[PDB]
């Protein structure tokens, strides 16, 4: 499932004077899943069941 | 601006047995902006203005 | 100060069939300082004074 | 193999007011190998075999 709002990612990239390839947002979606999986490991390592912003 | 679908991020975290704090999605959003800023630097370093999935 | 063992980073890169530019290890040193600074924020966020491997 | 100077990493962490767990440097080493593996993928994606600082 896509967790990313493609239009908002493309908008931010455009605001900096860059373009986005057709498959760029797919790559970022993969990185986002990795960031979350890493955060869950940190949450568990601190004996918590609630993910906090500082866990990412 | 939010780059993610909060409901889908919270759902994925719940599917792994975890809850999400009120500001956890905001933390992930901040990390995503940092990942994009890093990617723009990599795009420019390869004499491109089109961001590719491999730049993230 | 350099926190990286340049010879061991270059060795690992060589083992994968790649070469290392003259200024590559400097870039990785900068990323390492960022990783540590992020980890210290996570340590403090969990009311600890001792950095753990899971904080990185 | 360790890619970092443990004494200098522990010193930097101490300078910021923190202690380092016995296996904390091992955790950072693991993250560094991941950063290099990601960089090799970026190098190859730009039709290069020489890793640049901007690939990390």
Residue numbers in the entry:
A (entry chain A), B (entry chain B), C (entry chain A), D (entry chain B): 8 to 63
Paper text:
Histones are conserved DNA-packaging proteins found across all domains of life. The HLp monomer exhibits the characteristic histone fold, comprising three α-helices (α1, α2, and α3) connected by two loops (l1 and l2). Molecular dynamics simulations, DNA-binding assays, and heterologous expression in Escherichia coli, where HLp reorganizes the nucleoid, support a role in bacterial chromatin organization.
The best data set was processed to a resolution of 1.30 Å, and the structure was solved by molecular replacement using a dimeric AF model as the search template. The entire chain, except for the first seven residues, was well resolved in the electron density map. The asymmetric unit contained an HLp dimer, which assembles into a homotetramer by crystallographic symmetry. Within the dimer, the monomers are arranged in a head-to-tail orientation, with the interface formed primarily by the antiparallel crossing of the α2 helices at an angle of ~40°. It is stabilized by hydrophobic interactions involving residues V16 and I20 (α1 helix), a leucine-rich stretch in the α2 helix (L35, L39, L42, and L47), and F63 (α3 helix), along with polar contacts between loop regions. Dimer-dimer contacts are stabilized by a branched hydrogen-bonding network involving R49, S52, and N53 of one monomer and F63, T61, and R55 of the opposing monomer. HLp also harbors a conserved RD-clamp—an intramolecular salt bridge between R55 and D62—that stabilizes loop l2, a feature shared with both HMfB and HBb. Nevertheless, electrostatic surface potential analysis of the HLp tetramer reveals a continuous band of positive charge encircling the structure, consistent with a DNA-wrapping mode of interaction. The central α2 helix is one turn shorter than in the archaeal histone HMfB, while the C-terminal α3 helix is truncated and forms a single helical turn composed of the final four residues—similar to what is observed in the bacterial dimeric histone HBb from B. bacteriovorus.
